[PDB]
Design an enzyme around this catalytic site. Structure first.
Site, mmCIF file in Angstrom:
data_model
loop_
_atom_site.group_PDB
_atom_site.id
_atom_site.type_symbol
_atom_site.label_atom_id
_atom_site.label_comp_id
_atom_site.label_asym_id
_atom_site.label_seq_id
_atom_site.Cartn_x
_atom_site.Cartn_y
_atom_site.Cartn_z
ATOM 1 N N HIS A 14 0.999 -1.390 0.007
ATOM 2 C CA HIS A 14 -0.016 0.126 -0.013
ATOM 3 C C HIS A 14 0.906 1.299 0.001
ATOM 4 O O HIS A 14 2.173 1.315 0.243
ATOM 5 C CB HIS A 14 -0.884 0.046 1.033
ATOM 6 C CG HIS A 14 -2.056 -0.889 1.089
ATOM 7 N ND1 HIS A 14 -3.045 -0.773 1.943
ATOM 8 C CD2 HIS A 14 -2.310 -2.022 0.183
ATOM 9 C CE1 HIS A 14 -4.138 -1.701 1.582
ATOM 10 N NE2 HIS A 14 -3.754 -2.468 0.613
ATOM 11 N N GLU A 52 1.021 4.007 2.086
ATOM 12 C CA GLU A 52 1.555 4.270 3.320
ATOM 13 C C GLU A 52 2.629 3.721 3.760
ATOM 14 O O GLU A 52 3.707 4.121 4.087
ATOM 15 C CB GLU A 52 0.114 4.285 4.445
ATOM 16 C CG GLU A 52 -0.812 5.280 4.397
ATOM 17 C CD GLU A 52 -1.989 4.841 3.284
ATOM 18 O OE1 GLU A 52 -2.888 5.195 3.206
ATOM 19 O OE2 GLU A 52 -1.379 3.785 2.454
ATOM 20 N N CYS A 106 -6.233 2.022 5.823
ATOM 21 C CA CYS A 106 -6.468 0.682 6.146
ATOM 22 C C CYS A 106 -6.100 0.364 7.649
ATOM 23 O O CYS A 106 -5.147 0.824 8.265
ATOM 24 C CB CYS A 106 -6.609 -0.284 5.080
ATOM 25 S SG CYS A 106 -4.966 -0.886 4.993
ATOM 26 N N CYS A 127 -2.323 -0.439 7.342
ATOM 27 C CA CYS A 127 -1.433 0.811 7.165
ATOM 28 C C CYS A 127 -1.473 1.542 8.438
ATOM 29 O O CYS A 127 -0.495 2.159 8.970
ATOM 30 C CB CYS A 127 -1.931 1.750 5.938
ATOM 31 S SG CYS A 127 -1.191 1.176 4.465
HETATM 32 C C1 LIG Z 1 -2.772 3.027 0.346
HETATM 33 N N1 LIG Z 1 -3.697 2.024 0.017
HETATM 34 C C2 LIG Z 1 -5.121 2.447 0.900
HETATM 35 N N2 LIG Z 1 -4.988 3.610 2.025
HETATM 36 N N3 LIG Z 1 -6.217 1.333 0.970
HETATM 37 C C3 LIG Z 1 -6.277 0.454 -0.267
HETATM 38 C C4 LIG Z 1 -5.295 0.164 -0.870
HETATM 39 N N4 LIG Z 1 -5.478 -0.913 -1.804
HETATM 40 C C5 LIG Z 1 -6.603 -1.419 -1.328
HETATM 41 N N5 LIG Z 1 -7.080 -0.486 -0.315
HETATM 42 C C6 LIG Z 1 -8.249 -0.559 0.115
HETATM 43 O O1 LIG Z 1 -8.758 0.720 0.542
HETATM 44 C C7 LIG Z 1 -9.752 0.614 1.824
HETATM 45 C C8 LIG Z 1 -9.226 1.078 2.916
HETATM 46 O O2 LIG Z 1 -9.294 2.299 3.103
HETATM 47 C C9 LIG Z 1 -9.771 -1.114 2.095
HETATM 48 O O3 LIG Z 1 -10.651 -2.027 1.179
HETATM 49 C C10 LIG Z 1 -8.538 -1.423 1.480
HETATM 50 O O4 LIG Z 1 -8.472 -2.918 0.977
HETATM 51 C C11 LIG Z 1 -3.906 1.035 -0.809
HETATM 52 O O5 LIG Z 1 -2.849 0.795 -1.639
HETATM 53 ZN ZN LIG Z 2 -3.464 0.141 3.531
#
Ligand SMILES: Cn1c(N)nc2c(ncn2[C@@H]2O[C@H](CO)[C@@H](O)[C@H]2O)c1=O
Ligand SMILES: [Zn+2]
Ligand SMILES: Cn1c(N)nc2c(ncn2[C@@H]2O[C@H](CO)[C@@H](O)[C@H]2O)c1=O
Ligand SMILES: [Zn+2]
Lengths: 157, 157
Positions: A52, A54, A82, A85
């Site tokens: 991700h 972050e 999430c 993160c």
């Molecule tokens: C950086 N980043 C973030 N911040 N969130 C992601 C990412 N990839 C999927 N998600 C979805 O976002 C929702 C959370 O807010 C969940 O469904 C997570 O699975 C990602 O790369």
């Molecule tokens: Zn995340």
């Protein structure tokens, strides 16, 4: 300055989607007013579901600073971190988190209902201590618009 | 076979603490009784606060299998996964989690009071889906003993 760095995280989200690196998410880590790391989601580039934005920013900023704690830095996230993160932000000991869009904006466009209790203040076993700021005004509108503008331009994950 | 992979994770915890790679934690990812990845905490070796045993194992298993989902795989954690690592396990789509020691065993020797609400069923927002097994019997005993035996060999980071 909050707005400048949040907008740079949003820009990272657009860039990463355009490169096919991952999904519409960016993150920027700054020391005072100096960018330490600027990253976007790399899940597809790295074949790494932990990559991700972050987490990526945290890894790069710890490498650039040669230490495993970032107590003197802050992090700007285009979307609400999430659970994975937010946990990484706790372990990294970043002193402040500023985020743009609520998780609901990302959920509305196909991502999982995967929300961090400790960030929203409903944690029991996990208590946050860092300062948390949800953006308003233009920052919020920019961040929220990311998910409309990139709606069908990337592969979900 | 749960016992076999769990004790392999325990041995990884000991190996990493002895090499100085990080804290006493190990994790093994398995695909129909074939070990895909066998790793321990690498936070010190990589200068990366996200490089817990489970995350490191998820990175390696995904790189090996050329996919970002481990939906046919299972993970064995020597210690109960922290919020970041439980978030990672969810994102990875792992089918099943088996862990040895309770988190209190690590906290007793000075580790962060940092427990995953979704693992213990105590969240408002984050619910868990996957099969979770706390080991008992001789496996659980050997796993809990890791922290009292380890105390001497590493400095808490
Ligand atoms: C950086 N980043 C973030 N911040 N969130 C992601 C990412 N990839 C999927 N998600 C979805 O976002 C929702 C959370 O807010 C969940 O469904 C997570 O699975 C990602 O790369
Ligand atoms: Zn995340
Ligand atoms: C794999 N792994 C696990 N599972 N836990 C770790 C690690 N490094 C520190 N911790 C602490 O252990 C408690 C969580 O149970 C918290 O205090 C965490 O900070 C680690 O690499
Ligand atoms: Zn962990």
């Amino acid at each position: 300055s909050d707005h400048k760095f949040l907008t740079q995280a949003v820009e990272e989200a657009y860039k990463g989607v355009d490169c096919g690196d991952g999904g519409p998410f960016g993150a920027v880590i700054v020391h005072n007013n100096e960018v330490v790391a600027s990253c976007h989601n790399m899940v597809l580039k790295y074949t790494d579901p932990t990559a991700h934005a972050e987490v990526t920013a945290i890894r790069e900023a710890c490498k650039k600073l040669n230490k495993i704690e970032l107590s003197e830095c802050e992090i700007y996230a285009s979307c609400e971190p999430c659970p994975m993160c937010f946990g990484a932000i706790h372990l990294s000991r970043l002193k402040r988190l500023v985020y743009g869009a609520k998780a609901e904006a990302a959920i509305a466009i196909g991502f999982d209902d995967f929300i961090a209790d400790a960030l929203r203040g409903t944690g029991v076993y996990q208590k946050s201590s860092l300062e948390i700021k949800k953006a308003d005004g233009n920052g919020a509108a920019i961040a929220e618009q990311v998910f409309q503008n990139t709606k069908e331009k990337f592969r979900l994950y």
